Amino acid sequence: NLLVQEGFEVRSTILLDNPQQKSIERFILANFDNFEQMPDELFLVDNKVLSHHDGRTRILARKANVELMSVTELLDAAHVSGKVRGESYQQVIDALTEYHASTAEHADYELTSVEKLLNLRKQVEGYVLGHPDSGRVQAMNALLNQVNSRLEAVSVLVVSEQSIKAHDSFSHLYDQLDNANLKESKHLYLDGNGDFVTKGKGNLANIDKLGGSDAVLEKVKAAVSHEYGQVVADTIFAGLSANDLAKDGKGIDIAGLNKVHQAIEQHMSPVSATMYIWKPSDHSALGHAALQIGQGRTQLEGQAAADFNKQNYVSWWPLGSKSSNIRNIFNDLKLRWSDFSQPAHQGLNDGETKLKRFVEKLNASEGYASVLLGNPDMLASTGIPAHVFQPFVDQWNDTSYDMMDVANRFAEELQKQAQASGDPALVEKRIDNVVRLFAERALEEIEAFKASQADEGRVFRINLEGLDVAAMQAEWNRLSNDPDARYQLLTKNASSTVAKVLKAGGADKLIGHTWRPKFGVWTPTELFNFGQALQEAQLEIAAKK
Ligand SMILES: [Cl-]
Ligand SMILES: [Cl-]
Numbered sequence: 001n002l003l004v005q006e007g008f009e010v011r012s013t014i015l016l017d018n019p020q021q022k023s024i025e026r027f028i029l030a031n032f033d034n035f036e037q038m039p040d041e042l043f044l045v046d047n048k049v050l051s052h053h054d055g056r057t058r059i060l061a062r063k064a065n066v067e068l069m070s071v072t073e074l075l076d077a078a079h080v081s082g083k084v085r086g087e088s089y090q091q092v093i094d095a096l097t098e099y100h101a102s103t104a105e106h107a108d109y110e111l112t113s114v115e116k117l118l119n120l121r122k123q124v125e126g127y128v129l130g131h132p133d134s135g136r137v138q139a140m141n142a143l144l145n146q147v148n149s150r151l152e153a154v155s156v157l158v159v160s161e162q163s164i165k166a167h168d169s170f171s172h173l174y175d176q177l178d179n180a181n182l183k184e185s186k187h188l189y190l191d192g193n194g195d196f197v198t199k200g201k202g203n204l205a206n207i208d209k210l211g212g213s214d215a216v217l218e219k220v221k222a223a224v225s226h227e228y229g230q231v232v233a234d235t236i237f238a239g240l241s242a243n244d245l246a247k248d249g250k251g252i253d254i255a256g257l258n259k260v261h262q263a264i265e266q267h268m269s270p271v272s273a274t275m276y277i278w279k280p281s282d283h284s285a286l287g288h289a290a291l292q293i294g295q296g297r298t299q300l301e302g303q304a305a306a307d308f309n310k311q312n313y314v315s316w317w318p319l320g321s322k323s324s325n326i327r328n329i330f331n332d333l334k335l336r337w338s339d340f341s342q343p344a345h346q347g348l349n350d351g352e353t354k355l356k357r358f359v360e361k362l363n364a365s366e367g368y369a370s371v372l373l374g375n376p377d378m379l380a381s382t383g384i385p386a387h388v389f390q391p392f393v394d395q396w397n398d399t400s401y402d403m404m405d406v407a408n409r410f411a412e413e414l415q416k417q418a419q420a421s422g423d424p425a426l427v428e429k430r431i432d433n434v435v436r437l438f439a440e441r442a443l444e445e446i447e448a449f450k451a452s453q454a455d456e457g458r459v460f461r462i463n464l465e466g467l468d469v470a471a472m473q474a475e476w477n478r479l480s481n482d483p484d485a486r487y488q489l490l491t492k493n494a495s496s497t498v499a500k501v502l503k504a505g506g507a508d509k510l511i512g513h514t515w516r517p518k519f520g521v522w523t524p525t526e527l528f529n530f531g532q533a534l535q536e537a538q539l540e541i542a543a544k545k
């Protein structure tokens with residue numbers, strides 16, 4: 001047989017764990033049945049016994065094998081003849097795709113592959129929250145059970161655990177609205193488990209018995225309180241009427257649930273966003289705009305809060321990626337307007353020089369190939385499909401340092417791809433744009449920062465209240481989280497990207513009417529005046545209470 005040493009270890013490298021030196025040890029070897037057939041890791045935390053083999057965490061016993069369905073398996077299970085796949089169904093399919101993607105080169109308990117898993121849960125739940133009569137629900141429920149089995153097995157080993165939002169949070173509810181796509185007059189009800197649900201067909205009874213019970217309103221209150229404490233819950237419900245809470249003044253519809261959402265936000269964080277407007281003293285020069293989205297309801301601490309902050313910063317490219325792209329093409333730098341709005345009581349030279357000698361070096365397409373294969377984060381923004389470039393990226397990276405032949409062979413492929421498309425002008429412009437448009441844009445920005453440090457203009461700030469932060473965060477996430485979204489930022493004003501994010505957060509509702517910039521195009525001077533009208537709208541709203 002084999003001996004066990006100090007969790008524990010076994011040797012003929014196979015770890016073993018008990019939650020420690022009790023009579024639970026008697027239950028352990030009982031389960032164990034064989035010699036070479038042993039999982040790398042094995043655990044005993046509760047009535048559940050769990051193992052980690054390869055990259056996969058499983059829950060083995062409670063004294064049942066659980067495969068998450070593949071996308072095609074799900075296509076077979078959610079199939080409903082005659083019906084088109086709607087956005088809600090697409091959001092799920094995509095989230096499942098992104099998940100199985102992550103278990104390929106990660107352990108299931110890594111935070112990346114858990115955030116993936118959570119989003120799946122988030123997307124399934126909202127599927128059902130918003131489409132209770134869909135012929136899809138059976139398959140969704142089957143998938144949901146699978147996900148929760150996965151979360152349960154895995155969370156034991158997730159290191160932080162903080163990102164995992166309690167099943168009884170206000171967040172865990174609110175998160176479902178995104179993929180629910182619910183009409184706001186729709187009410188929330190509770191089922192025979194007291195879970196949140198909406199009803200369509202068995203509807204009439206619930207519709208008739210509305211004032212009859214407050215279990216729904218009290219569940220929502222209980223949720224807020226479990227997450228934000230009784231003080232927050234007391235305070236924000238104290239100033240929410242019954243008709244704020246529901247069109248008809250009974251229970252809670254979705255409009256109401258959003259008012260609970262926003263209310264929590266104003267409480268935790270009075271300002272929704274800060275708009276920055278750089279007005280250079282003018283070399284016949286260009287003005288700049290950016291927006292910092294606040295933290296709203298979000299409860300994060302330390303490093304993760306700083307990260308969240310940087311990722312909520314709106315410009316012509318997401319900030320973490322801009323930063324790395326800039327280093328990558330050469331190899332700390334701070335690239336926010338907030339960084340230069342300090343005034344005299346407490347890099348941009350090595351980066352400015354390097355970038356000047358890059359654009360002008362680019363202003364003279366074989367060289368291009370070398371740059372994209374260096375920057376794959378940017379190469380995916382060119383519109384060339386992964387399966388085409390990756391062979392070459394791979395060749396460049398690992399295979400023997402035989403670089404220049406590959407760089408040349410890649411350039412050839414780019415032209416075969418431009419022809420295939422049936423619009424080569426367009427393919428070629430897009431590659432060109434990624435490569436060099438980004439360089440020029442980053443350069444011009446760094447130069448504005450410098451111009452501000454050398455006091456050659458003025459950075460204006462507008463602090464905006466009353467907008468839907470979460471909404472703004474999500475919009476900006478759309479606009480920046482895939483390689484295409486980014487190409488779409490690259491080729492427009494920061495001013496307009498900002499205006500799209502403001503509009504997501506409720507801007508127009510605030511101002512009252514639809515705002516149109518002169519000619520229909522955003523500029524920093526347009527954003528500014530917009531900014532100012534939004535501020536005037538808030539006072540003529542908060543002063544109304
Ligand atoms: Cl949506
Ligand atoms: Cl800009």
